[PDB]
Design a protein around this ligand. Sequence first.
Ligand SMILES: [Zn+2]
Ligand SMILES: [Zn+2]
Ligand SMILES: [Zn+2]
Lengths: 1156, 45, 68
Amino acid sequence: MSFQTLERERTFKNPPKDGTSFPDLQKAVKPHVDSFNALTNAGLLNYAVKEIGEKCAFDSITQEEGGALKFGNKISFRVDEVQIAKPMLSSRERSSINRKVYPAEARERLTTYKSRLVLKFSWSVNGGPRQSEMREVGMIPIMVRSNRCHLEGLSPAELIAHKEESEEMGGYFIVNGIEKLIRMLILPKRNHPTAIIRPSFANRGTSYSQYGLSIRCVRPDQSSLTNTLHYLNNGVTMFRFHWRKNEYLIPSMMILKALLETSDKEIFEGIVGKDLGNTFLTDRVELMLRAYKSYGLYSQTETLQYLGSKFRVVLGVAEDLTDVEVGRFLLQKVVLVHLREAKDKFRLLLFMIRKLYALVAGECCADNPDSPQHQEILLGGFLYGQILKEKIEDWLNSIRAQINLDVRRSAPGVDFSDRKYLTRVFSKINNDIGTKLQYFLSTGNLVSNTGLDLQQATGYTVVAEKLNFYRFLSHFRMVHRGAFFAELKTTTVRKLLPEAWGFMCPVHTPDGSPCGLLNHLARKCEIVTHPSDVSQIPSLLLSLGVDPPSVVGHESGWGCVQLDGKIVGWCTYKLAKHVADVLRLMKIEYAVKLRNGTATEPAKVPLDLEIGYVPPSHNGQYPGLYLFSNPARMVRPVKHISTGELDMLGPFEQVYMDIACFPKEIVPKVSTHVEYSPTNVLSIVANMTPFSDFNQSPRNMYQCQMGKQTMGTPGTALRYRTDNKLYRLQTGQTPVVRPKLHNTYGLDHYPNGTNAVVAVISYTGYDMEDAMILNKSAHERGFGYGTVYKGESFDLSQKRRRGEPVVHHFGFAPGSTPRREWLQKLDADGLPFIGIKLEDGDPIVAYYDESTGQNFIETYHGTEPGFVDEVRLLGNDVGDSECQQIHVKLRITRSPIIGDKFSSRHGQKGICSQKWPTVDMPFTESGMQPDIIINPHAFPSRMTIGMFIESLAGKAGACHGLAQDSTPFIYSEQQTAADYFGEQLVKAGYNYHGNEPMYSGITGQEMKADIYIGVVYYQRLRHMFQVRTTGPIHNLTRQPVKIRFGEMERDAVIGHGTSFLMQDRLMNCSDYAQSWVCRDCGSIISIMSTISMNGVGSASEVRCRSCAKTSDIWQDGSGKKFVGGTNTTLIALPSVFNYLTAELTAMNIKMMLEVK
Amino acid sequence: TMIYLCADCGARNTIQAKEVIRCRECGHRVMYKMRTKRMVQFEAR
Amino acid sequence: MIIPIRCFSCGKVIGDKWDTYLTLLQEDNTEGEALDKLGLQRYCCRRMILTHVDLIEKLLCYNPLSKQ
Ligand SMILES: [Zn+2]
Ligand SMILES: [Zn+2]
Ligand SMILES: [Zn+2]
């Protein structure tokens, strides 16, 4: 492979008008963007609002023995649908062509990127009116590039027509200007009953035990709620769940007989109907039926009414209607919300308690919720829709509450037929929610009356920190488990349990405390987000050899098949595996058809569906076929080996699949799948690593974590970036050694370092302890040239607290103006010259008050010479606003200075120590000086052998002109890449071991030993002093205001036994003071200098008040004569002790220190 | 007055202090300041 | 940004040699070793005009003083 130059040039020169040149990137960000689309389209929100329902309000007449407390004027209202239009221009007309607002502008004017939000409100007057009307409830953000922005479908060309870079990605909501983002978080698996064993159960429900079973059941609008099965020691199971952030425990048997008009014999024959008289299952089930019988009732309706009458309070249901319908409300709304047919819910509850008991007796191994097996992902658009629906419902409940209080006062206006009344109440409630979503996206704090079945409730959003492009992408693709486990330091999930191969990268993970917690996805692993119809799945299963029974069609060796939480049939495990194989085969075959010319019918068997065939084994997972078609699942591709076609599966079949790593590794008759490539196991940044399969893994880990913090280009369209701090390096080039995907992924458009002439040699003596040297000449010649962009804005509204209108205006009050600094910097508008050098004590901008008519000023907080590259007059609003916001983008220069950090792409960080003179440097027989000298004392104990490999490869590819490919897991132990490059280089003419004979720069005569020289890719970091002789002292305690010395240092100095040094550093240098004391009374505050004795005469000899009562006598500042209190002396002591005495006197407790 | 640049339309606007801010020819509401000729001196390091 | 004249390692100026090397790959059908015709005997000042990114021809299409 060669560097695509003519491609790159005839790319840049003419931006493509067809489409994005780098589809892999758009695919890499595909999660969030498709989340947004599936939100707006794909009938997602309409499902949420429909399954919200409607709210009723009326005039309640108390029953007062009536039993049916009557009420006539009942209004039941609901929203028909949600309409999200494009973000028009600040909609209200401004006498201009009302156009759209591209997000670039929302970045510029530093404003959130919002679009109007419309509801279709519907009525009912307890008749059948149900007329409609649209209600605006504010404006909510929109994500970039998404299905409701003006940037989707756009080619890089018109993206350049706007001020977004050629390869815009989208994926962040622009709030206030700052790129916010919703992180991907891991949840358990959807709707699959998981087994659980955890001690935390038993200590709370003491009759319970750690044995348990749960399921996170989810509605069609993706609104999951959980409900756990608690197997208690007596034998019954409690049906835990959550509502109003509160746990609730109702006996399983209760809800069972309440679910279906069922006879207890039907229960017993469903639960254990098999192997008649299985000891454990029989006796436990009996105990359960009996313990419920103890108190419960018999028929279904009695239990329904009892339940409704028991739970009518926490329910926000219609108060007046009835009581049994309350129970049905429960049974429909909480128990198993994913399902709809009560009989089917009942069958599954049976299967669930059956599996639970099997787990009780060790007949099934414990499911691991701490494993990507039992886990799926939350997207952004999905949680966005869920919280949106939540606010919808709170809005409905608020307006219902307003109608209710409207009735309740006496009868101010009570006419649920006049639309005028509805207008009045609509105005009565706060009709903006868009600010609520914008608020959360700014904060992340999920303020909900219900946790939405989510452990943690804070920190839900990250900011798309564009410091570096890798930081960018990694921000998109990272996932996290939640600080609820971070507070827990254990050998728990923080471990890399080996179900991630090809799913989430092994090495790509920060170090420190959040090490292991947050892991990024692998390279190719996608998340299916668009479900499909599966009706032909039960049809095909029925035709295939299973059947759903009505009376128990179940026996011993028969396994159960699950369609994403719906029992559909049974078959022996041989039939189970055969069904699994034939079904995937149908899926793949119809896939290769629909992809190509073959007609694309509604897919019989779509690719997304995962066939979790679980073979049986003792003390293993509860065996059972498990078909899943739910979206939001981890799904990765490989090649099915029987055919030659694509194959997709998730982290449920992995643990049971023999997928070969290599076409070479396959052993026939068993291995049924082959990896596309081992590449497909790593993440993006970790994959973009020369010979990453060589260095000891911690090096690669530092490599990812630090390379995400590099001083490269953060993009191309910088001119219109309103960020706080960006970083750009001036002279960039692609590496000589690279993995191919660095060209594929279009990384040619964000170089992050250059290619240095590295020579490993212990020559100078300054480069130990990992240190490094920088050739002076190569440095002045334009080496890694750091350029910081620090962009500050100023705004006048903040200093307009209240009471007055806009008063300040930028510029100068007409008349006088300071020239000594201001007119030299400020142009005339109070705004500085474009490109004028500033310093610290320097005005930046000038506004004056109107009333006072005096000029104010703004100084440069920063403490390094900065210029100004551009100033921006932000239109404050829609229009008709004076310029109340200005934006200055200061450019700071940071050449490579002593004390800054460099690092190759192997975690080999170094520090610019001395910038050696270019002539005192050694040289090759060709003579070019080593631009960078590193030490040989860095490679042992760091195992960075891939560094040497990269070095040799660079030395070769540079000479020949080759873009050395270094993809991991190509070179075998047969021929080492060492030998391959050794051929390359011996062809170049250089040494085969990379050595080269060098002459000492300082002595001139050659070294006894050849020296290792190559061409590494070096990027610069950005992580890179306060003197205080004296200064301000504190207000209270006269301390130098906020360097630290003490409280561990004290141990040090007293360890040396060096008292004078201690009293010197901590008393003398800190706070030294003279104060008098009354020697007799021993108090330090009753002292006072005597007052007005005579003329200047002698000194005013201080005296004591406590020790007191013509020359001896004296007076007071108020004139009170006194006498005595003579014995007074002067003592040195730190003033902070004086402060202590003060605040201790404030307690009436005081010490009486004496003196000699 | 002051002379600025309509961001999109690219049109000199000649706006004055205490004024509604927008492009006069196209209506845009974001404008940069032009770079006047101002003596600045640099070292070559 | 622009091709960094006076390469780091070598002392040879190269800033002249960018478009003259570009229209060698472009229309001369020779591979990167056209730089051998340029006279970069070393590899040091050689690896610049080889793997230099000329990003600035894409940054320049961002004049807000485009008047259009
Ligand atoms: Zn006294
Ligand atoms: Zn305009
Ligand atoms: Zn050179």
